Design a binder for this molecule. Structure first.
Ligand SMILES: O=C(CCc1ccc(-c2ccccc2)cc1)NC(=O)N[C@@H]1O[C@H](CO)[C@@H](O)[C@H](O)[C@H]1O
Ligand SMILES: O=c1[nH]cnc2c1ncn2[C@@H]1O[C@@H](COP(=O)(O)O)[C@@H](O)[C@H]1O
Ligand SMILES: *Cc1c(COP(=O)(O)O)cnc(C)c1O
Length: 806
């Protein structure tokens, strides 16, 4: 037992054992003779859940009495992962439960592995929402996460013959002990219909109704007895030949069935539009109800709505609809209230990712909202015209309505017009927003534009996943850093401490052994634990340049084959991540990685000097295992393409060094740690711009770099696919003729930088000292810092570290 995991007092252990047995009997209806590990998991989950309930009821009661300003975080994604360990950590129950289960003859770590991830997100954006909920609870904010309860989250990834296969993620099959259904608070949502203009304003009539039923999940703050709520809506048909009519209820209920996995490319799918309106319409009724339970002038003083990307952008015209059509406020007053209530966070600059909904879809599904959007647009463009008289092209560029073959609504433009604050997610990204894609808006309303650099929760991403590191840190500086990560700066005093150097290195070794064991047990593959663990885990995208990593791997293989008896630093290269189902190039990249592995891992001349592993089914629970085990974090996106990144921050906190471009939050990470303690390579944003101006010619690099030429020839000729020699011709073609992300342009600098990594790894003491310098300066990247900045600079509320009574 370790100190950061809390006390195992005799009274507590006795009480936990008793309640475990009670739940096994009364809740699960099992006896100890036929109980499985799954039953034991559920008995523990219910036992821990019981400790949340008093705190949850009294937190919500406290908000009702004190009536603080409420923060509503609207997201289509909440990538929560597992709940059991996080709850124990935040309630200081971990050691007590470990003791209670041990005394019952059970291994708690084995029970933890049974829990399904709540995979209600795709990647960074979804996981950010999850870290944010944890920080908002920890900082005592009256905050509510609102989303959709998907029946199926992000698909499970299987690799079959080197190819991605998708399997439905039936995460609710065994039940969800954490949620509470609230069928009594079911609300109607309207679709289709038509608008009637009466003498008494507009009326939206002849609609189809879908019911929104809420399920509430507790969100505990770190040891402060605050328990906030995540409310997720589920779609239900209303109760009003016969057989078919009952069967057709599925059509309504399909709204909450499945998370869209296409994080690369916007497609105008009606079902996704319905999901976006569903969450917005149900949430806003809940917001207004809560506000009316103690004149809309005070609405922005009592309510903040944060839009996570443009996905809940319909909140803007929905709030207008409610205020104008139902509450009878004049347009100007309603608009003032709306702007002061709403704020918008942008997460990407790639044009193909922006939501641009066809007008014809909105006209049919949401005819009143389309009318409101047109009126917003006309009044907004009137302001632009008065500020920039005669600038007709600006009017076209800034319009919410896009002209063309199909007319579209630009949802980002809608969000900027209707929000008092617009933020990017890292300093470089927020600057790019002002200088490029939203330049016109910045010139009109400079005061709207902000930066809020992303962060991660140090509860899940240090204490939970890396208790060994948390403990050795706590031994020297105490426990206060867990909720005040800036205190890690105190560790700079230990950079020459021989004991600390040894302890940091020991913790990493243990994490690596544990992960190496996990790979053999669960996936039947053997790795050398003394090799450098070189890790790139993230969704598969061309911009993230898993392909550049692949080129380096093949370079190393070719160098070994050329000089087999020369010493090289042994590496285990691990790449993992899911590809969007319809993204052909991303699926080809996965196949390339496994194909390289097939050749490299079976070459007797290589031995255990180089191994290439594709990490199947990358998800939050796997990140918690692999990140503490990593030596080298690959953060290699083309400069200007990754808005922030957050995986980068997880690796920094956990004792990996970073090889990266000056992109997204990497810039600020290098600034914090010092450029000498970071492996920076490649084009800066300015260099990318210069290449675009003269034109990117991949052929030039192929002609001048013989090692690069060899790799392309190998790919083309069928070296990595002997039975299908032309398998990778799409990859070669893209690289040579149509590469938006300039893979070849960074190749030479990348390979050279990787040599410097290997050089440092040969000197374990200096490697570990650089690691200490990274861990010690990771404090800025706590989501507590991020949320404090949102609270003070956008929401107009003060964070609190003070305990509620237990
Ligand atoms: O996952 C997503 C988008 C997912 C998504 C999923 C589905 C649809 C969709 C829209 C319309 C029709 C059908 C589907 C759009 C987007 N984005 C994301 O993760 N962005 C990352 O946000 C992180 C948090 O700010 C940043 O650190 C990363 O830089 C950014 O790439
Ligand atoms: O009319 C009331 N009388 C007493 N307590 C209330 C009343 N309405 C709401 N509350 C409290 O505040 C609620 C929090 O849930 P909400 O209605 O979603 O904000 C409940 O859990 C109650 O504890
Ligand atoms: C942190 C995290 C991400 C985001 O990683 P990036 O490298 O920033 O894209 C994606 N998926 C999972 C499961 C994560 O935990």
């Amino acid at each position: 037992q370790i100190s950061v995991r809390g006390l195992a007092g005799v009274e507590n252990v006795t009480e936990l054992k008793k309640n475990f047995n009670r739940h096994l009997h009364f809740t699960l209806v099992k006896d100890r003779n036929v109980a499985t590990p799954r039953d034991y998991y559920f008995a523990l989950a219910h036992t821990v859940r019981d400790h949340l309930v008093g705190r949850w009821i009294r937190t919500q009661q406290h908000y009702y009495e004190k009536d603080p300003k409420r923060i509503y975080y609207l997201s289509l994604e909440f990538y929560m992962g597992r709940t059991l360990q996080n709850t124990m950590v935040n309630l200081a129950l971990e050691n007590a439960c470990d003791e209670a289960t041990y005394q019952l003859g059970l291994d708690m770590e084995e029970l933890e592995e049974i829990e399904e991830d709540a995979g209600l997100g795709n990647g960074g954006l979804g996981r950010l929402a999850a870290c944010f909920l944890d920080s908002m609870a920890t900082l005592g904010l009256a905050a509510y996460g609102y989303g959709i309860r998907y029946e199926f989250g992000i698909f499970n990834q299987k690799i079959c013959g080197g190819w991605q296969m998708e399997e439905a993620d039936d995460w609710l099959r065994y039940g969800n002990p954490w949620e509470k259904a609230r069928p009594e608070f079911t609300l109607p949502v309207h679709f289709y219909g038509r608008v009637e203009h009466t003498s008494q304003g507009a009326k939206w009539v002849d609609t189809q109704v879908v019911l929104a039923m809420p399920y509430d999940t507790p969100v505990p703050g770190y040891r402060n007895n605050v328990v906030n709520t995540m409310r997720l809506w589920s779609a239900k048909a209303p109760n009003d030949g016969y057989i078919q009519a009952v069967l057709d209820r599925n059509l309504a209920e399909n709204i909450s069935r499945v998370l869209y996995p296409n994080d690369n490319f916007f497609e105008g799918k009606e079902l996704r539009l319905k999901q976006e309106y569903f969450v917005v319409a149900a949430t806003l009724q809940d917001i207004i109800r809560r506000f009316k339970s103690s004149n809309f002038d005070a609405f922005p003083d009592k309510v903040a709505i944060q839009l996570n990307d443009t996905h809940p952008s319909l909140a803007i015209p929905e709030l207008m609809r409610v205020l104008v059509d139902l509450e009878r406020l004049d347009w100007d007053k309603a608009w003032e209230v709306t702007v002061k209530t709403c704020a918008y966070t942008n997460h990407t600059v790639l044009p193909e990712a922006l939501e641009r909904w066809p007008v014809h879809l909105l006209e049919t599904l949401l005819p009143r909202h389309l009318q409101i959007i047109y009126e917003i647009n006309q009044r907004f463009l009137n302001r632009v015209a008065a500020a920039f008289p005669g600038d007709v092209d600006r009017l076209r560029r800034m319009s919410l309505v896009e002209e063309g073959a199909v007319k579209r609504i630009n949802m980002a433009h809608l969000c900027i017009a209707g929000s008092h604050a617009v933020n990017g997610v890292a300093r470089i990204h927020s600057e790019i927003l002002k200088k490029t894609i939203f330049k016109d808006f910045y010139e009109l309303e400079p005061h709207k534009f902000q930066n809020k650099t992303n962060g991660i929760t140090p509860r899940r991403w240090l204490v939970l996943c890396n208790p060994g590191l948390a403990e050795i840190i706590a031994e020297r500086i105490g426990e206060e850093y867990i909720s005040d990560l800036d205190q890690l700066r105190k560790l700079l005093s230990y950079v020459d401490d021989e004991a600390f150097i040894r302890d940091v290195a020991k913790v990493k070794q243990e994490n690596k052994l544990k992960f190496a064991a996990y790979l053999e047990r669960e996936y039947k593959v053997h790795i050398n634990p003394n090799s450098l663990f070189d890790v790139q885990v993230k969704r598969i995208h061309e911009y993230k340049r898993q392909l550049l990593n692949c080129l380096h791997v093949i370079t190393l293989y070719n160098r070994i084959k050329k000089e087999p008896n020369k010493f090289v630093v042994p590496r285990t290269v691990m790449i993992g991540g899911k590809a969007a189902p319809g993204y052909h190039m991303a699926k080809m990249i996965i196949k390339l990685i496994t194909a390289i592995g097939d050749v490299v891992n079976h070459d007797p001349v290589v031995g255990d000097r180089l191994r290439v592993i594709f990490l199947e089914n990358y998800r939050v629970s796997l990140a918690e295992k692999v990140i503490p085990a990593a030596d080298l974090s690959e953060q290699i996106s083309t400069a200007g393409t990754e808005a922030s990144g957050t995986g980068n921050m997880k690796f920094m906190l956990n004792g990996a060094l970073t090889i990266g471009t000056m992109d997204g939050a990497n810039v600020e990470m290098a600034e914090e740690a010092g450029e000498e303690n970071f492996f920076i390579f490649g084009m800066r944003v300015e260099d990318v711009d210069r290449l675009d101006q003269r034109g990117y010619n991949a052929q030039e690099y192929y002609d001048r770099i013989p090692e690069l030429r060899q790799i392309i020839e190998q790919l083309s000729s069928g070296f990595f696919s002997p039975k299908q020699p032309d398998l990778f011709k799409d990859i070669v073609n893209m690289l040579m003729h149509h590469d938006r992300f300039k893979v070849f342009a960074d190749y030479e600098e990348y390979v050279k930088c990787q040599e410097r990594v290997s050089a440092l790894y040969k000197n374990p003491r200096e490697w570990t000292r650089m690691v200490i310098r990274n861990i010690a300066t990771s404090g800025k990247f706590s989501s507590d810092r991020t949320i404090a900045q949102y609270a003070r600079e956008i929401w107009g509320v003060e964070p609190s570290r003070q305990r509620l009574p237990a």
